[PDB]
Curated annotation (Swiss-Prot), chain B:
Disease listed for this protein: Estrogen resistance: A disorder characterized by partial or complete resistance to estrogens, in the presence of elevated estrogen serum levels. Clinical features include absence of the pubertal growth spurt, delayed bone maturation, unfused epiphyses, reduced bone mineral density, osteoporosis, continued growth into adulthood and very tall adult stature. Glucose intolerance, hyperinsulinemia and lipid abnormalities may also be present.
Listed name of the protein: Estrogen receptor
Name of encoding gene: ESR1
Protein family: Belongs to the nuclear hormone receptor family. NR3 subfamily.
Positions where lipid (S-palmitoyl cysteine) attaches: C119
Modified how: Phosphorylated by cyclin A/CDK2 and CK1. Phosphorylation probably enhances transcriptional activity. Self-association induces phosphorylation. Phosphorylated by LMTK3 in vitro.
Record organism: Homo sapiens (Human)
Assembly and oligomerization: Binds DNA as a homodimer. Can form a heterodimer with ESR2. Interacts with FOXC2, MAP1S, SLC30A9, UBE1C and NCOA3 coactivator. Interacts with PELP1, the interaction is enhanced by 17-beta-estradiol, the interaction increases ESR1 transcriptional activity. Interacts with EP300; the interaction is estrogen-dependent and enhanced by CITED1. Interacts with CITED1; the interaction is estrogen-dependent. Interacts with NCOA5 and NCOA6 coactivators. Interacts with NCOA7; the interaction is a ligand-inducible. Interacts with PHB2, and UBE1C. Interacts with AKAP13. Interacts with CUEDC2.
Domain characteristics, as noted in the entry: Composed of three domains: a modulating N-terminal domain, a DNA-binding domain and a C-terminal ligand-binding domain. The modulating domain, also known as A/B or AF-1 domain has a ligand-independent transactivation function. The C-terminus contains a ligand-dependent transactivation domain, also known as E/F or AF-2 domain which overlaps with the ligand binding domain. AF-1 and AF-2 activate transcription independently and synergistically and act in a promoter- and cell-specific manner. AF-1 seems to provide the major transactivation function in differentiated cells.
Residue ranges, annotated region (Transactivation AF-2): 4-185
Residues of the full protein shown: 308 to 525 of 595
Subcellular location(s) per record: Nucleus; Golgi apparatus; Cell membrane
Amino acid sequence: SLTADQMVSALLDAEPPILYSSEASMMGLLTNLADRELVHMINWAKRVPGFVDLTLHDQVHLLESAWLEILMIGLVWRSMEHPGKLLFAPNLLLDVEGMVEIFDMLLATSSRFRMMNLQGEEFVCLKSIILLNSGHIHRVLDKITDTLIHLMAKAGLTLQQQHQRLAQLLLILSHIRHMSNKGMEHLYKSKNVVPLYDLLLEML
Amino acid sequence: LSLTADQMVSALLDAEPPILYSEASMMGLLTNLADRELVHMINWAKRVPGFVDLDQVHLLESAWLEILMIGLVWRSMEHPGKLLFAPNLLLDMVEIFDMLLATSSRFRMMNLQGEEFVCLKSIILLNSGEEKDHIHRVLDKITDTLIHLMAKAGLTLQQQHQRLAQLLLILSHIRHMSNKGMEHL
Ligand SMILES: CC(F)(F)c1cc(F)ccc1-c1sc2cc(O)ccc2c1Oc1ccc(/C=C/C(=O)O)cc1
Ligand SMILES: CC(F)(F)c1cc(F)ccc1-c1sc2cc(O)ccc2c1Oc1ccc(/C=C/C(=O)O)cc1
């Protein structure tokens, strides 16, 4: 029911904080950083319009299917004004076997956003898209498109420039889904970061 | 890049490969089918306005299973519960099979037109990966094509953007389907 300006302001208020923090040392840091970031992500997801109307079962499913893409799109957004480096935290700016191909993708994605001049208002829309897309849900997904296109028209882009930019923005998401799949394959061995159902249920 | 929307949709519709035919028996039949489908794909790709002007090898290395999946998902559309691999090969790993039925159900639920299906395939192929901007400008042209095809259909500007968004968010699903399809292979 929210207006496109009311929506973008709710997403901007929903925004999580920026957190702080050898192969095993670096991994112990990344594992711990994401763990604490997961708790702030569950609070954020409930601040996203429409997600809290959903049954706990649906909320779980979406988060389990999107917790790494959400972490990565947040990462790629922070790291953006730091070319050649990945700002996992303000005290954790980096540049481990197998992890090299994934790091290089996350660098390329960050480099794409910057060249494309990604804005914070479009970013909060995209991260909200990923949460709701991972799995009424299509009614909300339509509302975030209307918000993105409203922000493109408010910025002065022509109707052509609007649908062209929307598409480029929605295709970089195929890459984020890919970066997530390869990451899930790499990390898993066992899991040290608490399954999100235990967390979501623990928080209510 | 000089090409119009109707010139782009018809150029791709012309490039459309033919429909082909057919446990160890099922996988062997599928390996053989796919192996014959890659030769038609490799040739279709050369007919994608922009693609032959390249790097082409890696784009088919990334999109070969996404293209095989979108094709399968497009064929099997009026066959709910079953997957139409070939007219003589209709089957009804289970995870990948279910993920493929859901996509086809979404394709049915959206009334996805063939003219829009060719555009998705060409976007899949190009977005799978001065020479780098060539891919960008072509994708921005397939998007004008998709929006024009919608304009013709009678949809409003708001009903156009939503539908563009709807179809594009399905490519994240087919990227995911391919990735988990690769692990299984
Ligand atoms: C290259 C790389 F580091 F980005 C990268 C490469 C991969 F293969 C996979 C993930 C990544 C990322 S993106 C990211 C964003 C952030 O805000 C914070 C942490 C991380 C993180 O690292 C992680 C993420 C999760 C875990 C969990 C382990 C467990 O359950 O035991 C460990 C390390
Ligand atoms: C369930 C399933 F069959 F869909 C499926 C599950 C997966 F995990 C991965 C892919 C699939 C698909 S999608 C498809 C579409 C088509 O038009 C035709 C064949 C196939 C095919 O099967 C394949 C694809 C490639 C190979 C290669 C083997 C080799 O190099 O030895 C074997 C079987």
